[PDB]
């Protein structure tokens, strides 16, 4: 008899498809996640106390002493227990915030500002979302981020130096990075970083492969404050997709005729055609020169859960992203998939082709088939957005269940307290001795910046402060540093977009924000940019925007991007079981190689 | 790796296909069947006897008293037990027939006629066929008919009135329903039925949905004695397929040439070309005006299993169906699939196209493929016949295991005994008081009809009798009333034919039986009939033929048609797993909607 | 504890029953089918062409050269590919018919007749039905027919000789086989066949068992043109069931009284009581002496798909089968199950008992149970018809997927072309040299017959032609020779009927068609015929009728009968799982042994 | 012993969760979809043509006559076949647009 | 201008509309569509700003 397959009911076929996808996911296997060892390494400095200090762990929300170290190790250990169980009652039992006034029930803050505002506490944002399963893609716990840099490492010294330089450079305009008027500061930044071992010495044989992949070399104006995804290094700092508008309704080719939108100019003034309405690329303008958490009392209140959310001031209006601070503002409030949805909408409006390896992408006279639900606009619009929550579950596992890395503000706190004590001949947080020594010149500038801010804030004679100035009043979100929500979602979303579109398409016109006016101008860039390159750049823009705000380190971002790529790939692989057509997505990965899914 | 399926051996693929079909059938779920409550409602009228009477249940074959009520309730309860077990020995233990003569062993009958014939008993026909499984289609027990009308209901009153009117109208010619010569009787029938609540009052919100679907309105000459399937109501009473012949061998189109059969006229004289031989549409002629079971003793003997089968007389010859009695004769002896096989053969000979959604139905120059074994004549010829036994198992379950509804003759027996007693001021079977009151005028006519028959049968001065005259000497088959074998098979078979053919095809010429001669004449009908419509009409013709014989009620037939439709649909659904081709059947269902299988 | 079984839900019991039946079918195992090796044996005779010629394979529809060999081997190889895949688009891509006129799109035929008719092509009838699964019975591919006779074999020589003799004997009346007026021709036929090795020499030890079973011996008037099923050899040529009518409505035994139908005579004039209507055994009369495809151009057009269906002429009226040609006509247009349904109806009307090993077959006073749905008339009427499609799937596999044997007309084509060429000293189709030499006398007669037909057809000076005259204008159906649709269905259907009835019942009166008038007469046969014997004879009648038309060989028929028997047996075996009763069918098989199922 | 549940690996728990969701969806059962009957109801108005007209069916893209009725019913029937198979080559074989 | 009747398809009964008014002209029948202005707030209003 002739070998054959058999049919079954549709319902059973659907069930079997779902089981086959689950089986595929299971058959990938799992890898462990390894932390860097700091959590139980660092011990209480008191000679009659053997307890861990937890100074390099995220402890935002647990009560801290005047040095910024948690008061009671049990507070953190219970937090860890609650992280791994996810039980809501157990979460509700944790210690959050400082001691409360028995008469009013309100937290008693250190700072006059916090007490005058009568601030309440804010809580951890989904501390157990790393336990949540998902109907599609790799399970949150099945993949790993590598150990975070330790406080004593050249990598961390380089990272924190860079964050201070970004903070002090917040009023610099992207289009003026190489302007003579900025040369003193820009060259200072370049020279400072080039003076650090991470940047001026290569990795050595036997170093962790993850370190080798992410380690940076000579700093230049051309790479200053940039990411390392392929494409980020070519042409202007900001991705085309975060400044340009799109082709507008009324511009179209109809047979042999070209119609021109009466609104065509809007493309070149940052208006994205969003269906039949518009998205403006112009960002709200946070008060220039105003930073936060530059006073130790306010800083400690924030570390103790003081809810400063909503405290920023703004100038009227909006403008195409101009300064480093503007990029920080952008990423303060974006929906996490916002940049990539917006890029997708520009690509669609501009008529950038889908992946030619999808079905039905030929002229309809040849294939008798146009695309929409599958392999078309509606498909990619759902797919780019749906991956975000799956990527976030995975990064939550890394953030809370694995690494619990302290946020940059916390590192800056240790540095400040250390430096102040050393000036009096005392050693506090020797763990950051190297950063304090290496960042001397930068910290001198930060001190001056902080005094100015402290005086502006109404303290006529402020204590010296070397804190990392925050772009946001509340500093970081209420979750650990490593990895990043923004960067994991960036990784997943741009992965989908490169997969779905013909990512090799070359962009015709390249723009930048004008040096003098709030408008786009032709870039002086002479090469060719591609969709793939500018999507990678967009991911790096959003990710580094968090660093420029003071809330993530370089390694948080890069490693998160890689994690999000894995999530999106796995979703595509499992979904491929569901289609009858013969096709694949061509995906250029972050590592420079291509996978067909 | 690229997702894939794998091959297996032919044998395993066949096995898996069969399992998948069984799985599909299992996954349909099952529904319960609900009886109307009469079985244990009606009690023995004797004040010292609390037993059920079972007067509204089928008890044909169990010994009855002089009123037609069973003598011993244990007889019926044992019958029920035997129905549910199917054990042959247990069946053989039941009580069947009246007491026997110890000298001859023969049953002792009430009637001189039965004793003179020395009749023996007949037994129940497959009382446990409702337990039989099947290799294809829905299991007999998986589907349901709704509760039957109760004796006290307006519906039952209407039903039994209609049956008496059919009995008294047996010598009326279909083609003369609206002839002035028949106006007195026809108007009597119309007026009587229009005087009944079922017909003259609509269903009300909250009535059972099944009642709402089958309830009839104003009776007219145009709908008198018709069914309600879509198509039955348009044009002449009898389906084309039970009177017309077909195209004959020798009539064909060969390229550009038309050849004409030397036997072409046979088409218009009721000859179906049956391969290279013929089927004659002409029915045998039962003696006009001769009815049966109009004497209470003969009636009770039949109730007590007296085997009167074969006792009818006939005139010589045969004729195209002319009278109501002729349709009764037709359905006395037909193979249950006979009408539909015959219709199928007419459709095939006349070249009516198969469903255009089947494969290979195009001219062969386009598809290189003609049809026969699959999607062609041999296919439909097996499929239309094979569904009959599967449908019959299902209706057996309803008949014997669920509802056990008394046959119309039994209802007429209660009515007659009641009315005779009431004339003497006594109350017997008050359960049918409403029917007796409502049917007064009809019963007056039946009394006169019965006296004439009783005299003809050799009783010079017969007792008054109000029994429902039977077309058949033995009355009903030896099984309960609800549902009907004929009607369930009708439902299943016409379902197959509408599915398999292009049922939307419009019929070119419409015929009727001539008013004066045994011949076809062109119908005066002005509209358009369709294949689907005339197949539905055929099903209603066969089903109502049983009612005209006196053996089923309207509700038995309609509900059975629906049950048979479900059986045929399920068979098609399970069979669809077996083909490699890309196709479906388009099936217009009885409810006016279409399913693609 | 006492060992026990348990109940489950009805629905699960139904499912398990179906799975158990599938398991039973799977556990039978499978056997391979072996072809005779001709397909790649015979090669193109051109010395510069090594390709197979495919001359012994069915290639009807593929374009042929002037000798009747296909023009392009790729045409046949693609046909084979399409056979095994069943893909409708692939089927639509095949080459069918000769080159077409670019102006009209019509095929360009060789013959004036075909061009004058403007014939189109006809396509293959379900070339992939051998891939179709079934819900019941053995899978189409699980069983086998043995290799067909090869062109060079004594068996094939005997087979083709017999077919020519039947063609030349088409006007001989069955009742006059032994009449002195027919003696010259009849003795010629007997002597010719007795001169052939197949008939005059026994099989030898080591010959294939299938050959030994089907090999025939001495030809006599008593076995001339008969089949070899047990029963075919006893009494008159034609089965009682293809000439007699049945008992008629109105003839019945009612208690101690015998009633006689006023239509009783119809039984003895070929009227089958078909419910309350009738089937006439009288067949349409194809023009005596008119054969087809006797001209090489017309023959080649038919081989190239010219659709001559419907081209025959007939005399007015109908008659009980009289001549060999009448049996050919019978089987031209019968529904494949028609003969056996008709026999079943005769058996039922005549009151022939069902198998006594079925339940409930006793008088009802003993068993309290009559039969209808199961073990009765409705049961057998569905079962005999349902087996036909299952048997046809199996024979399609053998026809198309396995053996692809050329039809007899094609063999006659090779013989004619060979003989014509040899007369000019050339060798064409040496493969049929033996047939040409052995059939010399027969071919001389065929030549004369063909010239007469060619002149009648309007060719005043026809080329010599030794083609096998066809009874049908289109010759064979559009599918290979081995096996036969008619014969496989015959095998399956008579198997069911012998199983279901008491096949040992002896028939009381034996009839034949009168020598002078169109009526039945008492046979002079002195022995006893049985139901089983006359059912076997009926199967052989239908099968050999195809051979008498010129469309099958002896071995096609016999082997098909055996295949159909296997299908029906397997259906009965699987269905036996579905009943609760204690019974079996007693089945006398074709090999003379009995199986109880 | 006290009745208990057991743990398994995270990976197996994820797999089992996904299967349980598929099982839930399967256990909902399915229902058929019924069309209104127009597709084969309406016939070609020409007295020598018994074909369906398909006038109440979506036929946008198939060639239409001057009245807006499709020219060739086979165009629509092939479209239906392609709809139910999804085969790209089969789709590419359909008739789209006028001559 | 005529209501559905007993025995009509349930789907018809659910979606069948009655008397047309300026207040329901060209509106849908989802609960809430019938109250207040034609257009949903969410297709004309802006939101609270940063
Ligand atoms: O949303 V973030 O993890 O980039 O703080
Ligand atoms: O064959 V019936 O159940 O219509 O009495
Ligand atoms: O229907 V046949 O295979 O006897 O040509
Ligand atoms: Br399903
Ligand atoms: Br987040
Ligand atoms: Br990968
Ligand atoms: Br196999
Ligand atoms: Br029945
Ligand atoms: Br349905
Ligand atoms: Br159940
Ligand atoms: Br066949
Ligand atoms: Br066997
Ligand atoms: Br695990
Ligand atoms: Ca396209
Ligand atoms: Ca065709
Ligand atoms: Ca019996
Ligand atoms: Na210590
Ligand atoms: Na301001
Ligand atoms: Na791509
Ligand atoms: Na500027
Ligand atoms: Na009582
Ligand atoms: Na056909
Ligand atoms: Na249909
Ligand atoms: Na008349
Ligand atoms: Na050669
Ligand atoms: Na003639
Ligand atoms: Na038998
Ligand atoms: Na004669
Ligand atoms: Na028409």
Curated annotation (Swiss-Prot), chains A, B, C:
Lineage: Eukaryota, Rhodophyta, Florideophyceae, Corallinophycidae, Corallinales
Protein name: Vanadium-dependent bromoperoxidase
Quaternary structure and interacting proteins, as annotated: Homododecamer.
Co-factor: note: Binds 1 Ca(2+) ion per subunit. The binding is important for enzyme stability. Binds 1 vanadate ion per subunit.
Binding site for Ca(2+): 360, 362, 364, 367, 369
Catalysed reaction equations from the record: RH + Br(-) + H2O2 = RBr + 2 H2O
Active site (UniProt): 479, 486
Enzyme Commission number(s) from the entry: 1.11.1.18
Cofactors named for this entry: Ca(2+); vanadate
Keywords: Metal-binding, Oxidoreductase, Peroxidase, Vanadium
Taxonomy, superkingdom: Eukaryota
Family of the protein in this entry: Belongs to the vanadium-dependent haloperoxidase family.
Provenance organism: Corallina pilulifera (Red coralline alga)
Record's function text: Catalyzes the halogenation of organic substrates in the presence of hydrogen peroxide.
Keyword Endoplasmic reticulum found: no
GO molecular function, one term: metal ion binding
Positions of vanadate binding: 399, 407, 484-486, 546, 552
